[PDB]
Structure formats: C-alpha cells, structure tokens
Design an enzyme around this catalytic site. Structure first.
Site, PDB file in Angstrom:
ATOM      1  N   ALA A 129      17.212  28.058 -48.878  1.00  0.00           N
ATOM      2  CA  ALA A 129      17.001  27.114 -48.726  1.00  0.00           C
ATOM      3  C   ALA A 129      16.795  26.150 -48.656  1.00  0.00           C
ATOM      4  O   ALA A 129      16.218  24.510 -49.024  1.00  0.00           O
ATOM      5  CB  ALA A 129      15.802  27.172 -47.193  1.00  0.00           C
ATOM      6  N   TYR A 130      16.888  26.439 -50.597  1.00  0.00           N
ATOM      7  CA  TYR A 130      16.544  25.075 -51.877  1.00  0.00           C
ATOM      8  C   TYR A 130      17.476  24.869 -51.848  1.00  0.00           C
ATOM      9  O   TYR A 130      17.982  23.895 -52.308  1.00  0.00           O
ATOM     10  CB  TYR A 130      15.939  26.858 -52.607  1.00  0.00           C
ATOM     11  CG  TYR A 130      16.806  27.014 -53.544  1.00  0.00           C
ATOM     12  CD1 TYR A 130      17.165  27.223 -54.573  1.00  0.00           C
ATOM     13  CD2 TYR A 130      17.134  28.767 -52.779  1.00  0.00           C
ATOM     14  CE1 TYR A 130      18.888  28.178 -55.416  1.00  0.00           C
ATOM     15  CE2 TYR A 130      18.700  29.106 -52.982  1.00  0.00           C
ATOM     16  CZ  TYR A 130      18.866  28.990 -54.118  1.00  0.00           C
ATOM     17  OH  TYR A 130      20.134  29.659 -55.159  1.00  0.00           O
ATOM     18  N   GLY A 131      19.268  25.037 -52.028  1.00  0.00           N
ATOM     19  CA  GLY A 131      20.376  24.920 -52.310  1.00  0.00           C
ATOM     20  C   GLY A 131      21.829  26.433 -53.144  1.00  0.00           C
ATOM     21  O   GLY A 131      20.760  27.014 -53.281  1.00  0.00           O
ATOM     22  N   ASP A 186      12.666  29.724 -63.315  1.00  0.00           N
ATOM     23  CA  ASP A 186      12.651  29.101 -62.121  1.00  0.00           C
ATOM     24  C   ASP A 186      10.621  29.144 -60.969  1.00  0.00           C
ATOM     25  O   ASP A 186      10.199  29.809 -60.873  1.00  0.00           O
ATOM     26  CB  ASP A 186      12.479  30.288 -60.356  1.00  0.00           C
ATOM     27  CG  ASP A 186      14.017  30.094 -59.861  1.00  0.00           C
ATOM     28  OD1 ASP A 186      14.811  30.025 -61.008  1.00  0.00           O
ATOM     29  OD2 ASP A 186      13.874  30.288 -58.798  1.00  0.00           O
TER      30      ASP A 186
END
Lengths: 10, 341
Positions: free
Chosen positions: B30-32, B164
């Site tokens: 959902a981040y990329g 991250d």
C-alpha cells in the site's frame, strides 16, 4: 575490520 | 536531466533514468512497489521504490515529505541512505511520481539465521552495529519505532544496516515496547533499545522472546519476565483506563535473566537486563550500550559518530496538499548524490 563471515541465501 | 525510458511491469508503468537496468519486481504494498535493478553508475545492485500516489491526501503528501526528508538526512555506515531520488516530471506543474533508490545489501537478519547458526561473536558484532547506527539516529531526535529482524540487512562480511523507518505516525508487535503497543504514554528513543533487546535475545536462544498472539497475551509474557509496574512507572501512564487495568493485574516479580538465558555469555545477559527494563526512563541508551563490556572488542568512541541537527518543525505546520507537494518537489530538486567511492 572484523574477520567475520556469513552466508547469504539465494 | 538523465534520459528516461519507460516500461510496464506487473501492470505498473516505471519511468526511470537509463542508468538503472534489468528491473525486476521484488514486491509491492500500500506504500508503493519496489524493483530490483542494477545501477550502471555505481556498478551496484539497488532497490528502486515507486511511491503509491504520494499526494492523494494532505496526510499522504505530508507523509511523503517526511520520508524524503528523513532519508536525505541519513548518512551513516549502519543506516540505509538515499542513493538517488527522481521523478520523470519536468516541472512542478506535472510532478506526480516519486522514485526512491537505495542499496540492496544482501539479506535481512531472518534470512541469515535461517541459513546458519551464529557464533557469540556474530551476535556481538551484529548488535554492536545496530546500536552504532541507533546512536546516530537518536542523536538526531529520530526514533525508528519499528525495529525487527526483517528491517535489518546484513552482508557477507556480517556488516549491517538499519532500514525501513516507521513513518506512519503476529510480527512487528513482538519487538515493540509495551508503552507503544498499548499507547500508555508518549514514548522516547528507548523504544528502539527495547526492540534491540528482543532481537538480541532471539539471536542467542533461537527463540522469539515475546511472541504474544494478541496485545494482552504479549503484555503478560512481557510482565512475567520484567515484573509488574511499580508506582513510579504507573504515575507516568497517562491513560486512566490503562492505569486501572495495570493495577488489576496480579503483581509479579522480575525474573532472574540468568535463569532464562542459561549458557549465554554472562555479559550479553547483563546487557539484556539493561535493555529490557519496563520503565523506558531506566533503559540503557544506545550510546551507553556501545560502552558495555559485551562489545569490548568492537567499541571505539572516536568511530561512533552522531548526526547533524535534524529539523522537524515541519511536523507542526498545517499546509495544503499542494504546499506539501511543492515542498517535496524542492527536496527532490536539491538532492545531492553520495560521493562515488
């Protein structure tokens, strides 16, 4: 630098 | 402006500079989506990440700006840095996609453990590097907030980097400090020291330390090792309901860690005791840990650098989506690549 070794998985 | 070439992979258009070749979808979220590729400029393989609609909402725009500002500031051997950031856009008017490039180091800690049994030496060197990068991070008033084995990359020489960072505000939960997991209070940098503790223990015993099925189950495993809260800590818990639930628990005494980690280096057991303290104000700090006897063979005060000041006043600005978007563009525009080695 530290004489350590590690195996990296495929 | 480099020469771009656009291509379609896993139903996603990737338009990047020609220096990045043989792009291979490594995954998505959902981040990329992220692609593996080879960087012909450094001769190194890398991770190319394309953000998922960076400016969908004010929230996303701001989150995008936070991630970019954070990655640009990270310059330390034990923390991932921004190798490159770009956009095929030729101006703000058309600015829409943001691509982030970072180093592909080898494998995360989990994949290392799965491959071989580590020696006490490896653990020493590994935890040392974690604390070394953490010292750098905390000195900049940054808290990772999501340390776990999957966020630790390790190369063939056992060298490590933290990746991250948590940007948002089982698994993950198992390495989280209790004051976070249950929102007991405003937490401090030591939440990462709590994570380091959980990680170290696992590397020594080959077992997850607090694998709770849910928040309550985990809190119990935790409070069973470190003992139930004392009046001093309780008064720090801001939530009245939280305090109420704590007091409802059957008091428990701290366990003797030596009785839990039989056979481990006495020095490593001591360090664990220092990191796994329930009150965050009593936990040992990154800088303090590097000076602990367990790391005597790797510690070097003149080679454990802090970071430059990191300005976070932006967190308290109330801006329009497009102001956050232009701010992001400016950051892209001013990015200076890392010196070629």
């Amino acid at each position: 630098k530290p004489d350590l070794r590690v195996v990296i998985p495929p | 402006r480099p020469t771009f070439y656009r291509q379609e992979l896993n139903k996603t258009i990737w338009e990047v500079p020609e220096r990045y070749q043989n792009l291979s979808p490594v995954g998505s979220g959902a981040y990329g989506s992220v692609c593996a590729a080879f960087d012909t400029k450094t001769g190194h393989r890398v991770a190319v990440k394309k953000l998922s609609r960076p400016f969908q909402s004010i929230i996303h725009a701001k989150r995008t700006y936070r991630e970019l500002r954070l990655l640009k500031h990270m310059k330390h051997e034990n923390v991932i840095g921004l190798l490159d950031v770009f956009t095929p856009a030729r101006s703000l008017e058309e600015f829409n996609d943001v691509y982030l490039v970072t180093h592909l180091m080898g494998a995360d800690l989990n994949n290392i453990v799965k491959c071989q049994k580590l020696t006490d030496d490896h653990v020493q060197f590994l935890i040392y590097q974690i604390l070394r990068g953490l010292k750098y991070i905390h000195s900049a008033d940054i808290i990772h907030r999501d340390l776990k084995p999957s966020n630790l990359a390790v190369n063939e020489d056992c060298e490590l980097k933290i990746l991250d960072f948590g940007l948002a505000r089982v698994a993950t939960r198992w390495y989280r400090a209790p004051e976070i997991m249950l929102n007991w209070m405003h937490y401090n940098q030591t939440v990462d020291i709590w994570s380091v503790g959980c990680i170290m223990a696992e590397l020594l015993t080959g077992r997850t330390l607090f694998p709770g099925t849910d928040h309550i189950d985990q809190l119990k495993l935790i409070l069973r090792l470190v003992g139930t809260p004392g009046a001093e800590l309780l008064k720090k818990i801001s939530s009245e309901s939280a305090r109420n639930y704590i007091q409802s628990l059957a008091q428990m005494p701290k366990m003797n860690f030596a009785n839990v980690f039989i056979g481990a280096n006495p020095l490593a057991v001591d360090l664990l005791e220092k990191m796994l303290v329930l009150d965050s104000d009593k936990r040992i700090t990154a800088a303090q840990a590097l000076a602990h006897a367990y790391f005597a063979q790797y510690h070097d005060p003149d080679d454990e650098p802090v970071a430059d000041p990191y300005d976070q006043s932006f967190e308290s600005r109330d801006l329009l989506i497009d102001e956050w978007k232009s701010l992001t563009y400016d950051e892209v525009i001013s990015f200076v690549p890392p010196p070629l080695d």
